[PDB]
Paper text:
l-Asparaginases hydrolyze l-asparagine to l-aspartic acid and ammonia. The prototypic class 2 enzyme is EcAIII from E. coli. EcAIII belongs to the Ntn-hydrolases, which are expressed as immature polypeptides that dimerize and then autocatalytically cleave themselves into α (∼20 kDa) and β (∼15 kDa) subunits to form the mature (αβ)2 heterotetramer (a dimer of two αβ heterodimers). The same Thr179 acts as the nucleophile in the autoproteolytic maturation and in l-asparagine hydrolysis.
The introduction of Cys207 resulted in small rearrangements in the Lys203–Val208 region. The side chain of Cys207 has a slightly different orientation in the two dimer subunits. Glu234 has two conformations in both subunits: one with its side chain directed towards Arg238 and another with it directed towards His119. At position 211 a nonpolar Val is present, but this substitution does not affect the conformation of the catalytic Thr179 or the efficiency of the autocleavage process. In other variants, for example RDM1-12, differences are visible in the regions of α-helix 147–159, loop 200–208 and loop 116–120, while in RDM1-38 differences are only observed in the region of α-helix 147–159. Moreover, a multi-step denaturation process was observed for most of them. Analysis of T m of the autoprocessing mutants reveled that they can be divided into two groups: those with decreased (RDM1-3, RDM1-8, RDM1-29 and RDM1-37) and increased (RDM1-12, RDM1-18, RDM1-24 and RDM1-38) T m values.
Numbering used by the authors:
A (entry chain BBB), D (entry chain DDD): 179 to 313
B (entry chain AAA): 2 to 159
C (entry chain CCC): 4 to 14, 20 to 158
């Protein structure tokens, strides 16, 4: 699974996600990746999210929309919405993985509850940050 | 706010124990180049939507990441790929699931978004739509790598 | 304890309307009886949707609309608000009751969703019957296809 | 497209949705019906929802889950939530249709913005209500 989220200079949000799925997967099975609100969501009013992890769980939890709704309706900050979904709701459904999110205000979050998540982020005209492991 | 990109190439059991620095650096170098390309497009005034498309197209091309080239194998030693893209402005979206003959499923997903009255297309149906829009047909053999084949054998019995 | 059903939303003699009313009543009545008898919400929405699939008046199973190519492609999904488990199939043409296939995916597989032949193979390998897609074809829906093309 | 939503005597909600799609549809098209939180969602904490109509719009607006999030996080009554989604947010994206929804208190809502929704409901050991057209 791979993904990207962007805020542009016009203030527009977008999200994209792509995968080959799980090694040895049953032909015809579909995880969260291609499912709007599970593996991928963006709305200029909230957040752009791209998700990676247990598809069954990311679908049942609507991981990516849940970030949006928690912010839009709940009044959670991105940091708060990300902790809630990735560190609490997804583990209690048996979900492992993480996500990348950018909110309309340009806050960036890269939460994951796994050992690692291949990831990078940068502000325009700034130097990038990369990561594999925690911290 | 400030224009910004985030990318990922997957989450899970990545063990510090299991890698050399040279191995780690191949992933850091890949990630850095892709995020740097997106930072350059953003800075030039390209849309979030075009930026998240090219980033995911580069992560697809990158054989280290499980999407497009380097996709994992199915139990039948096939590849079946899915992708999604969403425009936060228009709230338009597009997706493909179960495609095996499209090199860049995030491009097929952009095509569903921008050139159809639909959000999601699957299988040969999705492929036939894309070919009809002039998207090029490939063999699913293009996605195969030894790394991912090795992981397949390691996971099973002969 | 309560049930709601629908047979779809969209753009008639009374006798004709009454056929829809009758069908809807028998199905809501069956679901009410099951509820009263203590059956699970899960079993009740499954059977209600199975009966709506079997009814040729509604666009699901028997009476499914026609594609641009005069074929039938069916989707279904079921969700249990108790365990929050779910199951779905999309693009299936040889399963009489896609809602029963969705249940099977929910119960007997680790995935929420399966599609196309792979959804069908999963089902057949678990004893679900293969049908000809012809069996969904009705006269009313064919003529609605020809109308649509015009 | 057909659906059912149910609350049982144990206070469990469930939802189910099935369809042939839309007449003349492009082969390989997939609407809201098979997508959790789009055509179908059940959670004992909120609501069970089955949706029918413009598949593309019910996906983009995550209609089924949006009812649940509006109630849970937003504090909307089932009635207010259903009115917002079906009367305001679905048409704002160029979609028509409706949905059936039962909350954990056993309120029933059957909103649609179309000329017609074939629909019926009843509390256990009560005579059912049926309907095709508006009101
Ligand atoms: Na790749
Ligand atoms: Na039917």
């Amino acid at each position: 699974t791979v993904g990207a989220v962007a805020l542009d200079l016009d203030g527009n949000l977008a999200a994209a996600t792509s995968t080959g799925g799980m090694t040895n997967k049953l032909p015809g099975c579909v995880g969260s990746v291609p499912l709007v609100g599970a593996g991928c969501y963006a709305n200029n009013a909230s957040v752009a999210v791209s998700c990676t992890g247990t598809g069954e769980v990311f679908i049942r939890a609507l991981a990516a929309y849940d970030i949006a709704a928690l912010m839009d309706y709940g009044g959670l900050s991105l940091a708060e919405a990300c902790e809630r979904v990735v560190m609490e709701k997804l583990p209690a459904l048996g979900g492992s993985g993480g996500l990348i999110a950018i909110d309309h205000e340009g806050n960036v979050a890269l939460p994951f509850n796994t050992e690692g998540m291949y990831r990078a982020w940068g502000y325009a005209g700034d130097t990038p940050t990369t990561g594999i492991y925690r911290e | 706010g400030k224009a910004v990109i985030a990318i990922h190439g997957g989450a899970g059991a990545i063990s510090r124990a299991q890698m050399s620095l040279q191995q780690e650096l191949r992933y850091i170098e890949a990630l850095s180049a892709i995020v740097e390309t997106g930072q350059k497009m953003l800075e030039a005034g390209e849309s979030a939507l075009d930026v998240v498309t090219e980033a995911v197209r580069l992560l697809e091309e990158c054989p280290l990441f499980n999407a497009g080239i380097g996709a994992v194998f199915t139990r039948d030693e096939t590849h079946e790929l899915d992708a999604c893209v969403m425009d936060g402005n228009t709230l338009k979206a597009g997706a493909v699931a179960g495609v095996s003959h499209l090199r860049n499923p995030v491009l097929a997903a952009r095509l569903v978004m921008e050139q159809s009255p639909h959000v999601m297309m699957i299988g040969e149906g999705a492929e036939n739509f894309a070919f009809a829009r002039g998207m090029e047909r490939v063999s699913p053999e293009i996605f195969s790598t030894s790394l991912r084949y090795e992981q397949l054998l390691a996971a099973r019995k002969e």
